[PDB]
Design a protein around this ligand. Sequence first.
Ligand SMILES: *[C@@H]1O[C@H](CO)[C@@H](O[C@@H]2O[C@H](CO)[C@@H](O)[C@H](O)[C@H]2NC(C)=O)[C@H](O)[C@H]1NC(C)=O
Ligand SMILES: *[C@@H]1O[C@H](CO)[C@@H](O[C@@H]2O[C@H](CO)[C@@H](O)[C@H](O)[C@H]2NC(C)=O)[C@H](O)[C@H]1NC(C)=O
Ligand SMILES: *[C@@H]1O[C@H](CO)[C@@H](O)[C@H](O)[C@H]1NC(C)=O
Ligand SMILES: *[C@@H]1O[C@H](CO)[C@@H](O)[C@H](O)[C@H]1NC(C)=O
Ligand SMILES: *[C@@H]1O[C@H](CO)[C@@H](O)[C@H](O)[C@H]1NC(C)=O
Ligand SMILES: *[C@@H]1O[C@H](CO)[C@@H](O)[C@H](O)[C@H]1NC(C)=O
Ligand SMILES: *[C@@H]1O[C@H](CO)[C@@H](O)[C@H](O)[C@H]1NC(C)=O
Lengths: 211, 292
Amino acid sequence: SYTNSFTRGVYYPDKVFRSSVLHSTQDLFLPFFSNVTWFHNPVLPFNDGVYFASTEKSNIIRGWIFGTTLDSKTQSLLIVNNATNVVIKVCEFQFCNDPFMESEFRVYSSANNCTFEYVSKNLREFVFKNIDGYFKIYSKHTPIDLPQGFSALEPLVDLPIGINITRFQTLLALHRSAYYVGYLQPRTFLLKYNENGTITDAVDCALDPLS
Amino acid sequence: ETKCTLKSFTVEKGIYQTSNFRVQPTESIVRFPNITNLCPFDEVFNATTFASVYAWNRKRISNCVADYSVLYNFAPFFAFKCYGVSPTKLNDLCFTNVYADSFVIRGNEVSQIAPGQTGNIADYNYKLPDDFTGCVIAWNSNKLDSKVGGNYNYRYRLFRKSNLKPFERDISTEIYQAGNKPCNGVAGVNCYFPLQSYGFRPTYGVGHQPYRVVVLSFELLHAPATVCGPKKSTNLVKNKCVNFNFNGLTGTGVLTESNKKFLPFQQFGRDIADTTDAVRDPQTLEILDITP
Ligand SMILES: *[C@@H]1O[C@H](CO)[C@@H](O[C@@H]2O[C@H](CO)[C@@H](O)[C@H](O)[C@H]2NC(C)=O)[C@H](O)[C@H]1NC(C)=O
Ligand SMILES: *[C@@H]1O[C@H](CO)[C@@H](O[C@@H]2O[C@H](CO)[C@@H](O)[C@H](O)[C@H]2NC(C)=O)[C@H](O)[C@H]1NC(C)=O
Ligand SMILES: *[C@@H]1O[C@H](CO)[C@@H](O)[C@H](O)[C@H]1NC(C)=O
Ligand SMILES: *[C@@H]1O[C@H](CO)[C@@H](O)[C@H](O)[C@H]1NC(C)=O
Ligand SMILES: *[C@@H]1O[C@H](CO)[C@@H](O)[C@H](O)[C@H]1NC(C)=O
Ligand SMILES: *[C@@H]1O[C@H](CO)[C@@H](O)[C@H](O)[C@H]1NC(C)=O
Ligand SMILES: *[C@@H]1O[C@H](CO)[C@@H](O)[C@H](O)[C@H]1NC(C)=O
């Protein structure tokens, strides 16, 4: 199905503190009141950044996989989380076309030429973007079909990869014993900054004459 | 100065603006970030066992900070020649990735590891392209890689059908066919074993003793931000008009202890009309106001 965001997918455009200052920015945002797919899984496009929310007290959503071909012959990213902790990784892989005791991981079958490694209810939003060989990730965890409210997303990671991306997927923990996808476009927003420096409200300046 | 400002010899009563007073700034404090993830040079230079010439170990270095002042200032280093880059400024020009090959060759063959050379080492085992950019280093290791009675573990190759191409590796062990009659993989006449292990001993002469080698080679294809050399962060002074450089933020002014609270990912603060008025010190992580 499809659902309507209300005011969702606002991230801090960068560092630099700031207080009460209706500051105006031009960037890639998720327009207000948008048409976000609903999923209850397949290869999607990327094309310009991605908003991505989810919900579940258990942890069924166990990371994403990115890239252009999602196989060998070209490089891709892989972001995983077993019951231990996050595992970012960048090799050339061979991905199951449907990749997903407590024994697991039928995700790929190849890990060649690795050029980057790393190891170590609920609503969990993420914004993924990829500019100038850097793959930026913003995120936010707010706990209780989406609802309605405002919550700005704080930057998490920065990866100087160089990787090309055109497609992405998701990873789920099977049964043996809900998520959305928006896209980002170049918009102009008006952000209201608190006195502690947090974004409390915003205005999308391409909605109605009032904006 | 008033007479000069008015261009006259008689000034009538009044009040005249004559010039300006501008405090002067001394010294230039250049702040920056640590080194953190650095180049683990302590392994490629200090392994207990080095590889052989025909099969040289190639270790690559990912995105880190490289401290070459540890290798330049350390040891005798019987030979140290850098070809594309000047040896001193190895800290201001950086590249996408570096590689550090290693092996153990004889003393009087070190002069063959260079762009445009010929010999049993530069044609059959390790060939450096004419467009080299890295910088070779080599030192003596007679006290480690030499056992009385012969050390037969280093195995330079001396027979091959053709000259090696730049930066290739050949570990095959087929039997070299010299004559015109095939030998089907057995020694004999006109068919030889292409490996000729060095007979290292301590009672040799310089030029026949083992000389470990490391060959750093740099590459910068298209990566914007990569491994780079280390910079500096002078001590931070306060309450004096100063010339400062916060990991990129270049400015001038008086620095003062703050009482604002950034969010723990924000570096500097701006005013309305967009001028930098606060920073965070990278090392101690405290907020400081910037007044002109
Ligand atoms: C190469 O490794 C050896 C041993 O791992 C290093 O020798 C150490 O030197 C430090 C500094 O004087 C001493 O505190 C240690 O006790 C030494 N180790 C031993 C086992 O005695 C040597 O410094 C290393 N060389 C380089 C260039 O890193
Ligand atoms: C960068 O290095 C400096 C030291 O060179 C680190 O400063 C240390 O900070 C801790 C606070 O957790 C103090 O307890 C230490 O005494 C400090 N060391 C010195 C020598 O002053 C600084 O923390 C490093 N940067 C980061 C981000 O950790
Ligand atoms: C989203 O777009 C699809 C495209 O056909 C349309 O059917 C659907 O009604 C749209 N949803 C909203 C909320 O506008
Ligand atoms: C979790 O997955 C990563 C992926 O490689 C793996 O390295 C790690 O060992 C896994 N955790 C455990 C406990 O095995
Ligand atoms: C990537 O892997 C393939 C197959 O393992 C190999 O042929 C190729 O040389 C590797 N890439 C590099 C840069 O070595
Ligand atoms: C990404 O793909 C495009 C295809 O149009 C290609 O031109 C570009 O070089 C690729 N990116 C990099 C960094 O090579
Ligand atoms: C954060 O903002 C609230 C309300 O704007 C304020 O009361 C508080 O003092 C600020 N600082 C905190 C919570 O550290």
